[PDB]
Amino acid sequence: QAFYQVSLLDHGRSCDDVHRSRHGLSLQDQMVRKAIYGPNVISIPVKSYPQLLVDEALNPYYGFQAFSIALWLADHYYWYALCIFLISSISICLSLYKTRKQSQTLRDMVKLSMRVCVCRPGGEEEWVDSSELVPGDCLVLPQEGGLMPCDAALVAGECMVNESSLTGESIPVLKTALPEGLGPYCAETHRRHTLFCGTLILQARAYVGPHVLAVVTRTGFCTAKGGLVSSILHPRPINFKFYKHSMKFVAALSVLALLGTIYSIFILYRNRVPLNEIVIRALDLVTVVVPPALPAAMTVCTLYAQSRLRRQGIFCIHPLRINLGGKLQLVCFDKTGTLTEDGLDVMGVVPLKGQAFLPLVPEPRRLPVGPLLRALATCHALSRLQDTPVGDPMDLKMVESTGWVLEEEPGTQVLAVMRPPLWEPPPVPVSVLHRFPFSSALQRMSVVVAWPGATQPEAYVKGSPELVAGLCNPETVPTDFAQMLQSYTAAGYRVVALASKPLPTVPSLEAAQQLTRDTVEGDLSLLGLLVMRNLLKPQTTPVIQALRRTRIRAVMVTGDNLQTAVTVARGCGMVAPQEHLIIVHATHPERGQPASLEFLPMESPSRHLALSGPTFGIIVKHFPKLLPKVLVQGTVFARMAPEQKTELVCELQKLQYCVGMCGDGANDCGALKAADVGISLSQAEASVVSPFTSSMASIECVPMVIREGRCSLDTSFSVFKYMALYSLTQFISVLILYTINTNLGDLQFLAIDLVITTTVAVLMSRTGPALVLGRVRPPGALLSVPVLSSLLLQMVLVTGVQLGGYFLTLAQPWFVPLNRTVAAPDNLPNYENTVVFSLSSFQYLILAAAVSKGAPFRRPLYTNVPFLVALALLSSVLVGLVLVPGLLQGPLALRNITDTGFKLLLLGLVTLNFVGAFMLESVLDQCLPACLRRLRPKRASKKRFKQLERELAEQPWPP
């Protein structure tokens, strides 16, 4: 009767229900469920070519150009129509290629199919089906190096999986068996028992089970790998798109087009040409005003920039966003693997005798056998790859520091057995009973471990110092724990605290392993603090100094302790030594206490604010009026959960800041997607994780993403402004002829539009970006006073030389007057056509050189090379033709002029116009300040960030 969403069908499923779904029906249920859900295939439509063309041809311009071709054919200027078709043909081919390439990349990612082993309710079938996989299907996963087709909760056993594409996470991720329960929660809601579509399985092992077996949850390409590709198809728009502002500027040109048309009507009525004939002249005037090569030129800008970035390594999707790059005002960054260096030496461990802390051991090897050694060795979730161990750089560096070595493949629920170094001045090899994974939000990991001693099993928890110390029973927790940790965090050593609890369970029993994560991480005794050292990436310190110099503010958003983040921030130059940092702190509103905000300064040898994640939580919920003041003044947001990073992005965006994100981790995945320009620095090739994936592991990417964006925005504005200048230059030329004896050209028009303008337009879009990122932001409105001024003033100079030419031509003593008695197509030679075309031809080229204006955002024009050769070549051909048309006289329909003097006068006028155009654009750059000061002495931006800044300047936060 009424359709129900697949999510709505399977939203309330119990923990038990996922186990109920396991060993699902072989065929009848499969078929009906598969029919209801639909086939498990990516929904990218496949088009041979002509299938695309019909859809592609529906664009409104294409209709107008088709009408124009017919109109020009009716006028019998076949040649101009021959060009007008050909330029549209180039436009459609390039648009087709652009569209085809954009789909092809996405389609190539999702073009994967492989034979799958599927479990029957009383069966275990092998390689039976893949694309037809049942929505609730249970399958046995491959042993090693196996891509997972569907998002499936793991019912039994443990899996090691590479999720690099899905989460931006290169490091191997542990997967564990789901626990059946009366409560219903989704596998995604667990966010760990689920195995995600399109993720490689490094290894798969069942300690107790015969093999690893998983039950499919959300599937059919509409979730995970496809859910994100599906996002890339029909993508989210950008608000207040600059094309609207250009469309307003087109209306200013529309007034000129109407004014021209009425001028023509009066001239034609005065001329007394047939009314039927005058309509064709009016129609030609309107069609000429439309530029044929603009629609192609807009595509070629983007395609060249994608080309420029692909070579730099910054692999891009949604190429429209490259311009958005140009406008970004703040760039958010992450601490570890981006601002700092991935991989960290263990700078020893600190042990505690009783309540008191003992002095730090430089090398973890030289320590007594007991809890801390075992915890340091066993806490990690490292697995053994072919002749090697694979894990998180921190956990890997820790175990190598201990000197204990992981045992290989060769009880029941016993895994990752840890072999001792077997050097003595007890070896007691130790085996893990239960593994708990590490979640960024959760901020800790835990293990249950047993030994041949066969005592009560001991649970070891390695986590963030504050949370672990808080979780520990306050018996062992030292009085000065905070102050002692403050030494290590202030130094800039990433610190993880280890806590041990003796657990009263039966050792080496599978059943005994089953336990509540909270119950294992409940009552705890603080054991020691690890002192990991992460060092700043060499290039980070430079890029941040440039981004601060441009006045694009850099905010730091991190899950690590506030003092370490402050040390990294003070190091990079987020906060310079001259600048002052305030630590906003908040007390929770609860019992008899209301919410309290306390601001305490920090002093080290622009009023920068550093806020812990929890303080920001209280500020957003219980101080909404203050949030604008802190988010426009906050530089080092720290101890932030993955969800909190998205909130900073969203609140900074609602304040009208254009955000950017350059994180390299699973924690940032949310923030990267939400942010305007999102960059994932550790990924290889194109990925769905971020809009602007990089393959360089540095912040050196971020300047390049801005620098190219500003170039693309200036190229878009230059190509638009040159296309307007050409059309008005054509309008003036065709009109000067329309008044004067009702004449035009055919082969001449093909030559100008097809060779002079289309070649220059495509070739002017490959100049490339400026060397250094600049203070001045690229101009963002096409309908601006400088742009409008520049175009209008230049067209006056175009007309001046053009009219001057005609006056000089008529004034020439040898000059023979025209006919003004026969139709424009019939009068194949006209003495005026020769002069007007010959003067105008060169000026069409000159406009591009003046328009280029390559300095703040783009490199000098000469550096282009293919443009510069074409400009010179076409100029040389035109110089050659104007001096001696020879053979080309006949095709050009040129009236041969023997006199050298008038040709030199004509060359002089073009040179004068050229000098004029260059002088006018240089004058325009110099004149802007005087104009701006007089037009507006002072102004206030509607955007909230610029006002809140100005308010804070007038009255600061309480000092």
Ligand X SMILES: Nc1ncnc2c1ncn2[C@@H]1O[C@H](COP(=O)(O)OP(=O)(O)O)[C@@H](O)[C@H]1O
Ligand Y SMILES: *[C@@H]1O[C@H](CO)[C@@H](O)[C@H](O)[C@H]1NC(C)=O
For 350, the 3-state DSSP assignment is strand
Q: How far is the CB of 557 from ligand ALF (least distance, A)?
A: 6
Report the DSSP pairing between strands 152-156 and 194-195: antiparallel
In angstroms, what is the minimal distance from the CB of 225 to ligand X?
23
Q: Which is nearer to ligand Y, 28 or 821 (CB)?
A: 821
Residues between 275 and 334 that touch ligand ALF (CB under 6 A) = 334
Beta-bridge partners for 525? 500
If contact means CB under 5 to 8 A according to the sort of partner, which of ligand X, Mg ion, ligand Y, none does residue 821 touch?
A: ligand Y
Q: CA 732 to CA 611: how far, in whole Å? A: 62
Among 21, 443, 476, 841, interactor with ligand X by CB under 6 A? 443
**Does 342 interact with ligand ALF (rule: CB under 6 A)?**
no
Q: Candidates 456-464, 473-481, 518-526, 767-775 — which segment interacts with ligand X by CB under 6 A?
A: 456-464
The dihedral sign for the CA sequence 10, 12, 15, 20? negative
| CB within 8 Å of 592: residues ≥ 6 apart | none
Structure-block tokens of residue 356: 């008191």
> How many residues sit in the footprint of ligand Y (CB under 6 A)?
3
| Residue 251, token pair as written in the block | 């209306």
Of 302, 558, 567, 838, the residue at the interface with ligand ALF (CB under 6 A) is: 558
Catalytic pick among 10, 137, 151, 334: 334
Q: At what angle do helices 540-549 and 701-739 cross, to 10 degrees?
A: 40
End-to-end CA separation in angstroms for the chain:
66
CB of 226 to ligand X, least distance (A): 26
Tokens representing residue 639 in the block: 């101890």
**How many of the chain's residues bind ligand X (CB under 6 A)?**
18
Number of residues assigned to the chain: 959
Is residue 665 at the binding interface for ligand ALF, with CB under 6 A as the rule?
Answer: yes
Chain residue at closest Cβ approach to ligand ALF? 335
CB of 819 to ligand Y, least distance (A): 3
- What ranges in 623-678 are assigned the alpha helix state H? 627-631, 642-654, 669-674
Minimum separation from the CB atom of position 720 to ligand X (A): 44
The residue from 483, 821, 898, 955 that contacts ligand Y (CB under 6 A) is 821
Footprint (CB under 6 A) of ligand X, residues 746-785: none
336 binds ligand ALF (CB under 6 A): yes
List residues bridging with 585 in a β-sheet. Answer: 598
Question: Active site includes 129?
Answer: no
Q: Which residue is nearest to ligand X (CB)?
A: 559
Rg from Cα positions in the chain: 36
SS (H, E, C) 550-581: CCCEEEEECCCCHHHHHHHHHHHCCCCCCCCE
The least CB distance from residue 556 to ligand ALF, in Å, is 8
Burial 321-342 (b: 16+ CB within 10 A, else e): bbbbbbbbbbbbbbbbbbbbbb
Annotated binding site: 664, 668
Minimum CB distance to ligand X smaller for 559 or for 628: 559
Residue 311 burial (10 A CB sphere; 0-12, 13-18, 19+): exposed
Restricting to residues 927-946, name those near ligand ALF by CB under 6 A.
Answer: none
Which residue in 156, 213, 100 sits closest to 510, CA to CA? 156
Minimal distance, residue 268 CB to ligand Y, in Å: 18
Distance CA 878, CA 899 (A): 18
CB-nearest residue to Mg ion? 665
Task: Please give the Cα distance from 460 to 496 (Å, whole number).
Answer: 13
Strand pairing class (553-557; 636-637): parallel
- Applying CB under 6 A, which of residues 166, 294, 394, 399 lies at the interface with ligand X? 394
Instruction: Name the one range near ligand ALF by CB under 6 A: 277-285, 410-418, 554-562, 757-765.
Output: 554-562
113 is an interface residue for ligand Y by CB under 6 A: no
Contact between 336 and ligand X per CB under 6 A = yes
**Which residue's structure tokens are 């966003």?**
321
Residue with tokens 């594409």: 165
Select from 437-445, 481-489, 624-632, 833-841 the region that touches ligand X (CB under 6 A): 437-445
Q: Which of 80, 221, 436, 438: binder of ligand X (CB under 6 A)?
A: 438
Residue type present at position 110? V
> Per-residue string for binding with ligand X, 534-573, x by CB under 6 A?
------------------------xxx-------------
Cβ–Cβ under 8 Å, residues 338 and 663: yes
CB of 738 to ligand Y, least distance (A): 18
Q: Which residues are catalytic?
A: 334
In the complex, the residues that contact ligand Y under the rule CB under 6 A are: 819, 821-822
In the complex, the residues that contact ligand X under the rule CB under 6 A are: 335-336, 392, 394-395, 438, 440, 443-445, 462-464, 496, 558-560, 667
In the complex, the residues that contact ligand ALF under the rule CB under 6 A are: 334-337, 558-560, 665, 667-668
